[PDB]
Amino acid sequence: ADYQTIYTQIQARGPHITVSGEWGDNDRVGKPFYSYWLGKIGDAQIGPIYLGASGIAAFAFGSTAILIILFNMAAEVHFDPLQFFRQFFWLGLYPPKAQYGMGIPPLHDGGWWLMAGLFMTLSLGSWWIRVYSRARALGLGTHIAWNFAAAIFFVLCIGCIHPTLVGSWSEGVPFGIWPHIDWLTAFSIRYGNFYYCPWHGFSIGFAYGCGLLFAAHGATILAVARFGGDREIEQITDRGTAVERAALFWRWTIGFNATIESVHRWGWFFSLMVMVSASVGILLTGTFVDNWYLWCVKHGAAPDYPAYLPATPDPASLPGAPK
Amino acid sequence: CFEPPPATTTQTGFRGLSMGEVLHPATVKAKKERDAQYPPALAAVKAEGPPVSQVYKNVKVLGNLTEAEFLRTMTAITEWVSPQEGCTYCHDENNLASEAKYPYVVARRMLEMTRAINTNWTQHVAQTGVTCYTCHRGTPLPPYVRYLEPTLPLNNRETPTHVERVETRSGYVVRLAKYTAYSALNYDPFTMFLANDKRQVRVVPQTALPLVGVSRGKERRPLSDAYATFALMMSISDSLGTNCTFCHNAQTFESWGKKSTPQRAIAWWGIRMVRDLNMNYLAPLNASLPASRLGRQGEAPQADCRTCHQGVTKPLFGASRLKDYPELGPIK
Amino acid sequence: ALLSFERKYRVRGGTLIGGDLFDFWVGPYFVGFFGVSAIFFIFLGVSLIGYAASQGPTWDPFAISINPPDLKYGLGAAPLLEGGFWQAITVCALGAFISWMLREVEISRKLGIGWHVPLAFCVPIFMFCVLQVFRPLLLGSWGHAFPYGILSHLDWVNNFGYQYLNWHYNPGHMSSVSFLFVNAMALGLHGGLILSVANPGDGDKVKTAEHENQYFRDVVGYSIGALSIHRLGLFLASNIFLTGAFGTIASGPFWTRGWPEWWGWWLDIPFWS
Amino acid sequence: MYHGALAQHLDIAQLVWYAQWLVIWTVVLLYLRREDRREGYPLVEPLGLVKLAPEDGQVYELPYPKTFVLPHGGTVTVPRRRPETRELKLAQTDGFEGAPLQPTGNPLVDAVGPASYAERAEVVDATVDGKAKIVPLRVATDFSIAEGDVDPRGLPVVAADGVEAGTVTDLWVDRSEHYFRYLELSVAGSARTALIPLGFCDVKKDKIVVTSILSEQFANVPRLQSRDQITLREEDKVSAYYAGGLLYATPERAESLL
Numbered sequence A: 001a002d003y004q005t006i007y008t009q010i011q012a013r014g015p016h017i018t019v020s021g022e023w024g025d026n027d028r029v030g031k032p033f034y035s036y037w038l039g040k041i042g043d044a045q046i047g048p049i050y051l052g053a054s055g056i057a058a059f060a061f062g063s064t065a066i067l068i069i070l071f072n073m074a075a076e077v078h079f080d081p082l083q084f085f086r087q088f089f090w091l092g093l094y095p096p097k098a099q100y101g102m103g104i105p106p107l108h109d110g111g112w113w114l115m116a117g118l119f120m121t122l123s124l125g126s127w128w129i130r131v132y133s134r135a136r137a138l139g140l141g142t143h144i145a146w147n148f149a150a151a152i153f154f155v156l157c158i159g160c161i162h163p164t165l166v167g168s169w170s171e172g173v174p175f176g177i178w179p180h181i182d183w184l185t186a187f188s189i190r191y192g193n194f195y196y197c198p199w200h201g202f203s204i205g206f207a208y209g210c211g212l213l214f215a216a217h218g219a220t221i222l223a224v225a226r227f228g229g230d231r232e233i234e235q236i237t238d239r240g241t242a243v244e245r246a247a248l249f250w251r252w253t254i255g256f257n258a259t260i261e262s263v264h265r266w267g268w269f270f271s272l273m274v275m276v277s278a279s280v281g282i283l284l285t286g287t288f289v290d291n292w293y294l295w296c297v298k299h300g301a302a303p304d305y306p307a308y309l310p311a312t313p314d315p316a317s318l319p320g321a322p323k
Numbered sequence B: 001c002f003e004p005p006p007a008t009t010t011q012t013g014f015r016g017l018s019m020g021e022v023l024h025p026a027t028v029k030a031k032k033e034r035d036a037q038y039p040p041a042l043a044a045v046k047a048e049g050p051p052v053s054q055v056y057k058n059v060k061v062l063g064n065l066t067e068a069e070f071l072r073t074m075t076a077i078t079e080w081v082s083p084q085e086g087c088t089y090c091h092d093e094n095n096l097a098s099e100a101k102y103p104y105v106v107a108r109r110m111l112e113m114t115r116a117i118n119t120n121w122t123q124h125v126a127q128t129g130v131t132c133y134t135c136h137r138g139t140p141l142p143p144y145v146r147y148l149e150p151t152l153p154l155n156n157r158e159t160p161t162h163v164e165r166v167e168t169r170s171g172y173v174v175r176l177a178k179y180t181a182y183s184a185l186n187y188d189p190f191t192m193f194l195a196n197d198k199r200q201v202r203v204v205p206q207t208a209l210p211l212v213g214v215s216r217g218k219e220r221r222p223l224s225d226a227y228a229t230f231a232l233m234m235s236i237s238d239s240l241g242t243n244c245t246f247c248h249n250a251q252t253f254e255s256w257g258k259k260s261t262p263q264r265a266i267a268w269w270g271i272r273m274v275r276d277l278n279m280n281y282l283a284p285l286n287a288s289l290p291a292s293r294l295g296r297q298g299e300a301p302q303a304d305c306r307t308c309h310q311g312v313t314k315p316l317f318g319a320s321r322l323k324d325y326p327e328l329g330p331i332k
Numbered sequence C: 001a002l003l004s005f006e007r008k009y010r011v012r013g014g015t016l017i018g019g020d021l022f023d024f025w026v027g028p029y030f031v032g033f034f035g036v037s038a039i040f041f042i043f044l045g046v047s048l049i050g051y052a053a054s055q056g057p058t059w060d061p062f063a064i065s066i067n068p069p070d071l072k073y074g075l076g077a078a079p080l081l082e083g084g085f086w087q088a089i090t091v092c093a094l095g096a097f098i099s100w101m102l103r104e105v106e107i108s109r110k111l112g113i114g115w116h117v118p119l120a121f122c123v124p125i126f127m128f129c130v131l132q133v134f135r136p137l138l139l140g141s142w143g144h145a146f147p148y149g150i151l152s153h154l155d156w157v158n159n160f161g162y163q164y165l166n167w168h169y170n171p172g173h174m175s176s177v178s179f180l181f182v183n184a185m186a187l188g189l190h191g192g193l194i195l196s197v198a199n200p201g202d203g204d205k206v207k208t209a210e211h212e213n214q215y216f217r218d219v220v221g222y223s224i225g226a227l228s229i230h231r232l233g234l235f236l237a238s239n240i241f242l243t244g245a246f247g248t249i250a251s252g253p254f255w256t257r258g259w260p261e262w263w264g265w266w267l268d269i270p271f272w273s
Numbered sequence D: 001m002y003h004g005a006l007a008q009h010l011d012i013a014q015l016v017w018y019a020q021w022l023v024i025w026t027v028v029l030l031y032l033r034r035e036d037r038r039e040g041y042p043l044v045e046p047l048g049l050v051k052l053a054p055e056d057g058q059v060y061e062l063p064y065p066k067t068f069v070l071p072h073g074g075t076v077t078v079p080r081r082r083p084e085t086r087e088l089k090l091a092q093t094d095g096f097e098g099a100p101l102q103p104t105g106n107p108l109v110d111a112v113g114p115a116s117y118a119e120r121a122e123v124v125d126a127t128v129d130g131k132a133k134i135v136p137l138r139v140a141t142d143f144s145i146a147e148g149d150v151d152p153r154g155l156p157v158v159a160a161d162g163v164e165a166g167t168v169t170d171l172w173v174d175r176s177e178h179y180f181r182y183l184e185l186s187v188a189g190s191a192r193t194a195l196i197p198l199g200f201c202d203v204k205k206d207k208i209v210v211t212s213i214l215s216e217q218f219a220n221v222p223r224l225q226s227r228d229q230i231t232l233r234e235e236d237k238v239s240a241y242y243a244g245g246l247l248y249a250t251p252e253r254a255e256s257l258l
């Protein structure tokens, strides 16, 4: 077996490299240090970190959002520190419970939620600028930023775009561990079972495919690490036996194959499509479809099944039944 | 952390749909033994003599019974409601027609309520019916009642923690969670849905596309109604010791016909019956109760699904005393 | 027929069974003995699906559903129309999947590469067994397994979840979901990164390994490195099912209540109760 | 009336369903599957004789060429014509189209099958700032073994047959990634040096075990041009040599394990 694919047997140390960027080389703070146990399964060097304007703006806005959330959470346990740790998972900051439409809600019923939403959104935009500009500063393409953009766009969809399209802030995602989980069922119940939303299906198809692709790609590179397949950039520009064997393994298995470069386009595309499909689904939901199951029945797609115990009429529609 | 196998499972939908009950035998046995404490029927007595309307002085509900029949009732009532306290719980030792103790007047209304249940709500209690025991289980205060705010523990026979106490505000989220099967849902399904008939449980649209005029802005129900319905369903499931598939094919929670079991219809009647009981029999009794029975808003204790069911899909696993005590209903 | 670089790799040997008898290609496809067994099982399973589907109500692909037997048949054979076809198809599936895996190890040996890919492919085969074999064994019926249909298998996932009131609170599920999410995110990052170095645009020159690490050190203060991200990605993806299988096997055999209630081990410690 | 309704039983969501499939198949078929073909295409047939005109599908399946501007000068364009020139010492075991080839000589030296190397540039891989990337420690003197880990320098190398075959004299390190990739070893009784990819090395505290080749086979490991640097093609030649041993070191390794 190739033990190098499991962990680094003999680690190496050397002077720390610094690639210069078009700006901000002085905003790298911290002194690098080395972790021997990290170095078994990764690169041993931790830090320094770049510390630009957008990154600080992100930390500023983020912490503001975190603080607004934590304070409202603590209010929910009347500031008892012990119950706060006990009940942490169950605590939350909720959008309005009452229907104000799109009017700004009272602070006690969703205003603080809206506030925390604003500052998180600013934090996401600020970090996006960091992710984008750091690439151009180092003379790299902006591929990560465009993937990250789709992920931010999906959050905005469930956070505020879908609420504004249907016209009620009551539909946003709460802040908190269990409560953001509870939203998923409330939403799916409201809109007629999300299994029958084709864009749920698409998103899941791509999410599962990301698991398929990264398991397959990761396994492939490790299987050709003896020929240096991990040095992917120079295998793109000068095809070595590593990527020839990787390409032929797949070709002989499934009948076709990618290149060392194109496999990353596949992976990038699949990842992006998780978020793009999710967003189309949310954008259609509530605006143009009210019950995804009935929409599938309307178009003849839903499965049906025999009764097992007897079919049961809606009692509310029998004559003389109470309301 | 975990419950050792095997599990008992049942089937409630077409094969391949994963519908049905999942039960831990130990737990079922412990509930079976708790419920087997149901006292057996007192021996039948011969109907003899005049109606007790002519014999006793203050008999307004049970007036058509004979003396032995009526005293048999009174023995059964004491066994079901106040066995440890005895007949003197409701009566003055020296004047059995005195209404001076509040349990007397309450018991009279409870008699009317119980026969109402067995006569007007057969759509829910069928031929099984209820007795005083179904709720009370041998104590004057039933172990599973609800106030207009959640209380812990669920069984009022256990002693509350400082945090469990309703006046400790830091314990509200936990009081609420334990009523909704430990979910973080931020809604009290009892005051929302079971205390009165003001709210609609259904939230799911019955059309594929959104209907213009109910689908935008303030025309829309807030999403919180869906959280609230879900919370009601968590609470209902936990109260019967069962899961959603007992009543629903989760393919379409809102559909009836093949998508619902007959138990879902019975449950629907149960919601209406509990509303009738609370609005018309139990909530008015804050006039007749001491202040130590009332909640922080002067409300009487009221009933939910757990009051009768106590964690079993049929109260007391289907035990019945209807044929043994005709005077409790149904009434022609 | 052949890629420009392929011929020098197309050598004899590396099989596990049969030696020369099946050591050949058909078009791009390597065959081998497990190539043959795979096609056998695929042909058998697809036949049974077709025969079973024709005895059913519809031909709409979204509505076809081959279902397991009623629970009352326990672990026994069930009549073909009411569960038997499901039983037969399931065995063909396992035959096909395992054949496919073993075929990949043969291809791996011939090329002189690691067996990591069939190894990784064991994880989803294992998960399939958890759902269709192991958990139904532990509960005592094939009836607890999921049905074969595009949309019907979602109805089973659906009801299965709601049998425990809110499946999201299943701790094995929480772990599984977290790996699905971070895996999809890492693959975007890894693919994004590689493309960004090889394709800076504008006729600018392609960058370097050191540029790769500089980028992530700058943005998040750490860079795991080229070889390591591939190890991590296999680890992340594999743990979607490796941890998930516990949350699945637990539900029913080792837990019968709702999954929210399970967290009482934390909430109900007397110290802060 | 209904949000999202259109005339004649159409709704918007139904249209988006079609559009979404169209987008997917467009990207997969017209973009990704052509990107997949920037290597190894056009394919090779039993002699493509039509030198006068290309067959239509071969033009259609290819993307427009792209040019990489290399970091230390030069350009690479893909796809491009790159036939494999060198004579392969293989013979067809049958007349069938996809019958396997057999090695006629010694497949490790002849560099066929798992021993094949790619025809990469006879060029030394470079650091960001132009230095040689893969260098032995005698040259890379500001690099050390990390404290904790076996220093293999001095340890013996045991081959598959259990025979000591040489002694590890140096580690080659990747200066770009801070990662050791090869051990250098003197092959006992042959007055030469050989490189070994770490991935073929079982690093124990008293020995380096190497199961891919026999002790005698260390004699014909591809040699380098220079002592203190390596070219990309040499890296391929060296790595491939041991991988070829997995199938060829003994007659029994190519036959079925069962």
Ligand code: BCB
Residues within 6 Å of the ligand: A195, A200, A201, A202, A204, A205, A206, A208, A209, A212, C046, C049, C128, C131, C146, C150, C151, C153, C154, C157
């Ligand atoms: C425990 C939970 C499970 C689950 C939960 C689930 C959900 C919630 C959703 C799906 C969806 C899907 N599932 Mg399903 N599922 C599927 C297959 C499918 C596809 C129909 C679809 C998209 C899959 C995908 O893109 O993956 C990534 C793989 C890729 C991209 C490679 C391509 C695979 C190809 C598209 C699959 C096509 C398979 C054929 C339709 C079936 C084979 C037919 C035979 C005759 C050849 C198989 C083959 C299995 C097996 C063998 O176990 C399986 C098990 C499960 N699914 C478990 C039961 N799955 C989605 C859907 O839209 O269903 C309608 C969906 O929303």
Ligand code: BCB
Residues within 6 Å of the ligand: A062, A065, A066, A069, A120, A123, A124, A151, A152, A154, A155, A158, A175, A183, A184, A185, A187, A188, A193, A194, A195, A197, A199, A200, A203, A204, A207, A274, A277, A278, A279, A281, A282, C157, C181
């Ligand atoms: C009962 C209810 C269910 C439900 C309800 C549901 C809803 C309501 C929605 C989904 C959605 C999705 N569901 Mg689904 N679901 C899924 C899978 C999925 C995902 C693939 C998809 C997209 C979500 C995502 O990736 O977010 C992970 C990624 C996120 C959230 C992006 C975050 C990026 C952000 C930049 C991160 C930054 C954070 C900051 C650093 C932190 C700062 C915080 C501080 C300041 C507070 C599977 C595999 C199954 C199975 C097996 O049954 C399933 C069943 C269910 N879902 C049931 C049907 N699901 C979404 C969808 O696709 O709908 C069409 C969706 O909207």
Ligand code: BCB
Residues within 6 Å of the ligand: A184, C097, C124, C125, C127, C128, C157, C158, C159, C160, C161, C162, C166, C167, C168, C170, C172, C173, C176, C177, C180, C240, C241, C243, C244, C245, C246, C247, C248
């Ligand atoms: C109401 C019910 C829900 C539910 C019920 C549920 C259940 C009951 C189970 C899961 C499980 C899982 N859920 Mg969950 N879920 C998930 C995500 C997930 C997955 C990560 C995880 C594993 C799925 C699996 O086993 O695939 C299975 C995939 C397999 C087996 C692939 C087999 C492939 C095979 C080897 C090869 C197939 C070959 C083809 C036939 C060949 C054809 C190819 C063609 C192209 C030639 C998300 C992201 C969400 C969101 C966003 O809400 C969600 C919500 C829900 N889940 C709802 C709450 N979910 C599973 C889990 O791990 O739980 C802990 C699980 O058992």
Ligand SMILES: C/C=C1/c2cc3[nH]c4c(c3C)C(=O)[C@H](C(=O)OC)c4c3nc(cc4[nH]c(cc(n2)[C@@H]1C)c(C(C)=O)c4C)[C@@H](C)[C@@H]3CCC(=O)OC/C=C(/C)CCC[C@H](C)CCC[C@H](C)CCCC(C)C
Residues within 6 Å of the ligand: A046, A047, A049, A058, A059, A060, A062, A063, A123, A124, A127, A131, A144, A145, A147, A148, A149, A151, A271, A272, A274, A275, C181, C182, C184, C185, C188, C189, C219, C220, C221, C222
């Ligand atoms: C399919 C597409 C997937 C996808 C894609 C992508 N996702 C990306 C990118 C892409 C392309 C990036 O380029 C960017 C990034 O930068 O990666 C390195 C990023 C992000 N996705 C994060 C979280 C996330 N993605 C989720 C999901 C999906 N994403 C879906 C699945 C989910 C889920 C599932 O809920 C979560 C929680 C953060 C790590 C990060 C934003 C931080 C932020 O917006 O600041 C917000 C400001 C703060 C102050 C928050 C502070 C804490 C966080 C953890 C940040 C701490 C970092 C700090 C450097 C620590 C110092 C350590 C040092 C001392 C040693």
Ligand SMILES: C/C=C1/c2cc3[nH]c4c(c3C)C(=O)[C@H](C(=O)OC)c4c3nc(cc4[nH]c(cc(n2)[C@@H]1C)c(C(C)=O)c4C)[C@@H](C)[C@@H]3CCC(=O)OC/C=C(\C)CCC[C@H](C)CCC[C@H](C)CCCC(C)C
Residues within 6 Å of the ligand: A208, A209, A211, A212, A215, A216, A219, A253, A254, C038, C041, C042, C045, C046, C089, C092, C093, C096, C097, C100, C104, C117, C118, C120, C121, C122, C123, C124, C147, C148, C149, C150, C153, C237, C238, C239, C240, C241
């Ligand atoms: C965490 C680990 C991840 C992971 C990993 C890996 N995945 C791999 C590899 C690795 C490493 C490969 O090396 C191998 C491959 O070669 O890649 C191209 C492979 C593969 N992953 C496939 C499907 C896949 N991966 C999924 C998930 C993950 N994978 C997770 C995420 C999912 C879902 C649902 O998520 C799907 C659908 C096939 C494409 C391919 C097998 C082909 C096959 O097996 O041929 C043999 C079988 C056939 C060609 C058809 C057989 C038909 C049977 C007999 C009759 C049908 C019965 C069937 C049960 C009916 C179902 C109906 C349905 C509607 C319910």
Ligand SMILES: CC(C)=CCC/C(C)=C/CC/C(C)=C/CC/C(C)=C/CC/C(C)=C/CC/C(C)=C/CC/C(C)=C/CC1=C(C)C(=O)c2ccccc2C1=O
Residues within 6 Å of the ligand: A212, A213, A216, A217, A218, A220, A221, A243, A246, A247, A250, A251, A253, A254, A255, A256, A257, A258, A259, A260, A263, A266, C026, C029, C030, C031, C035, C036, C038, C039, C042
């Ligand atoms: C008729 C007959 C007798 C035949 C005998 C021969 C025989 C056994 C034939 C088999 C016939 C069968 C069953 C064919 C079916 C083939 C199958 C299962 C195809 C599935 C294809 C699917 C859907 C794959 C999903 C994954 C996906 C999107 C892949 C696209 C990208 C690719 C090609 C990834 C593979 C791949 C990865 C993962 C790399 O890392 C890598 C690194 C460097 C170079 C190349 C690659 C590479 O090609």
Ligand code: HEC
Residues within 6 Å of the ligand: B055, B056, B057, B058, B059, B060, B061, B062, B063, B074, B075, B077, B078, B081, B082, B086, B087, B088, B089, B090, B091, B096, B097, B103, B104, B105, B107, B108
């Ligand atoms: C509360 C739950 C009671 C207990 C315990 C007992 N009794 Fe009772 N009794 C109760 C009520 C509400 C009434 C009025 C009934 C009606 O139909 O209006 C009665 C009535 C009687 C009577 C008739 C008295 C009279 O009006 O003259 C008798 C003789 C009587 N009760 C006796 C009795 C005995 C012996 C009990 C213990 C076995 C007993 N009662 C318990 C309420 C309650």
Ligand code: HEC
Residues within 6 Å of the ligand: B077, B081, B103, B104, B106, B107, B110, B111, B114, B130, B131, B132, B133, B134, B135, B136, B140, B141, B142, B145, B277, B282, B289, B293, B300, B301, B302, B303, B307, B308
């Ligand atoms: C559930 C549907 C009930 C049935 C059936 C019966 N009772 Fe009841 N009772 C119920 C509640 C929720 C309450 C309020 C809590 C309380 O303690 O008041 C009561 C109350 C009483 C009382 C008053 C006891 C006290 O407050 O100390 C009495 C005397 C009583 N109930 C008697 C009684 C009898 C005789 C019943 C059968 C004819 C009966 N109850 C049925 C709930 C339910």
Ligand code: HEC
Residues within 6 Å of the ligand: A189, A316, B201, B202, B203, B204, B205, B229, B230, B233, B234, B236, B237, B240, B242, B243, B244, B245, B246, B247, B248, B253, B254, B255, B263, B264, B265, B267, B268, B271, C162, C165
């Ligand atoms: C039987 C004792 C039930 C169990 C267990 C669960 N539900 Fe239920 N549900 C039940 C009824 C009788 C009704 C109708 C209520 C009415 O007053 O009309 C409902 C309703 C729902 C709905 C709303 C459907 C709609 O038309 O909008 C939902 C979404 C729902 N139920 C979900 C649900 C879930 C998730 C459950 C397990 C947690 C569950 N129900 C259990 C009866 C019963």
Ligand code: HEC
Residues within 6 Å of the ligand: B117, B124, B125, B126, B128, B129, B130, B134, B236, B240, B263, B264, B266, B267, B268, B270, B271, B272, B274, B303, B304, B305, B306, B307, B308, B309, B313, B314, B315, B317, B318
């Ligand atoms: C006492 C007054 C009750 C209250 C309050 C509720 N239920 Fe009930 N239920 C009661 C009886 C006596 C029976 C009959 C048992 C029998 O053998 O038929 C029932 C039955 C049900 C069922 C049927 C279960 C079955 O296995 O067929 C269901 C689903 C049910 N009850 C649900 C239910 C709900 C949701 C309630 C709160 C709204 C509820 N019940 C209250 C007695 C009483």
Ligand SMILES: CC(C)=CCC/C(C)=C/C=C/C(C)=C/C=C/C(C)=C/C=C\C=C(C)\C=C\C=C(/C)CC/C=C(/C)CCCC(C)C
Residues within 6 Å of the ligand: A066, A069, A070, A114, A116, A117, A118, A121, A155, A156, A158, A159, A160, A172, A173, A174, A175, A176, A177, A180
């Ligand atoms: C014009 C103005 C007035 C209105 C528009 C404002 C606007 C743009 C609002 C947008 C709001 C949005 C996008 C809301 C979206 C909210 C979403 C998706 C929330 C989702 C999940 C939240 C979770 C899980 C939060 C949990 C909170 C905590 C755990 C407490 C915070 C503490 C932490 C340490 C955070 C850790 C989070 C994680 C890394 C573990």
Ligand SMILES: CCCCCCCCCCCC[N+](C)(C)[O-]
Residues within 6 Å of the ligand: A053, A054, A057, A122, A125, A126, A129, A133
């Ligand atoms: C919507 C996000 C707004 C955030 C504003 C704060 C970010 C400042 C951006 C500074 C970028 C400077 N630059 C281009 C040289 O990197």
Ligand SMILES: CCCCCCCCCCCC[N+](C)(C)[O-]
Residues within 6 Å of the ligand: A195, A196, A197, A198, A199, A200, A201, A202, A296, A299, A300, A301, C062, D014, D017
């Ligand atoms: C996971 C959900 C998938 C459900 C797929 C249903 C798609 C229906 C699209 C119908 C196309 C329109 N038409 C005319 C053919 O009915």
Ligand SMILES: CCCCCCCCCCCC[N+](C)(C)[O-]
Residues within 6 Å of the ligand: A201, A202, A205, A206, A256, D028, D029, D033
């Ligand atoms: C539900 C998500 C759909 C994902 C579709 C991706 C499938 C890849 C198809 C590969 C096609 C192969 N080939 C050679 C025919 O082009």
Ligand SMILES: [Fe+3]
Residues within 6 Å of the ligand: A217, A221, A232, A264, C190, C194, C230
């Ligand atoms: Fe890669």
